[PDB]
């Protein structure tokens, strides 16, 4: 069908990600509205409401029933190129798409690099504290 590492790109798959999810009809941040904004529901015990943009990888929790998924997304990751995509997926050119997929994988990389940095830095304090205690 569609390459199973490219479905986050189409709304239906994004909706289909919403398994539990509170907030439905009556609320502004429905599945449909989350998915139109780029969100994927990636739930856990510690937080069963966490949403992630498939494109920029921003993770946002603490959803309020009247949060606008789009505004919520602009006012937390102004960078996201997905916000700029104003064409349907089928209406995308292979270039446009391949361009978008380039920036995506990059984001995936920058996100993983920002993470490695922090873990490193945290390790560096514990080592430094320890050798300090020895002082």
């Amino acid at each position: 069908t569609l390459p199973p590492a490219w479905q986050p790109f189409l709304k239906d798959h994004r909706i289909s990600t919403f398994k539990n999810w509170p907030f439905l009809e009556g609320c502004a941040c429905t599945p449909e509205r989350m998915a139109e904004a780029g969100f994927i529901h990636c739930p856990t015990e510690n937080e069963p409401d966490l949403a992630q943009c498939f494109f920029c990888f921003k993770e946002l929790e603490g959803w309020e029933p009247d949060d606008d998924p789009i505004e919520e997304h602009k006012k937390h990751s102004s960078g996201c190129a997905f916000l700029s995509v104003k064409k349907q997926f089928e209406e995308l050119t292979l270039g446009e798409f391949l361009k978008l997929d380039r920036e995506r994988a990059k984001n995936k990389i920058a996100k993983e690099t920002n993470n490695k940095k922090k873990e490193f830095e945290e390790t560096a304090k514990k080592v430094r504290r320890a050798i300090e205690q020895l002082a």
Binding site: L50, A51, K58, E59, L60, E61, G62, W63, H76
Partner: peptide, 4 residues
């Protein structure tokens, strides 16, 4: 919504 809040940043993790």
């Amino acid at each position: 919504a809040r940043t993790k």
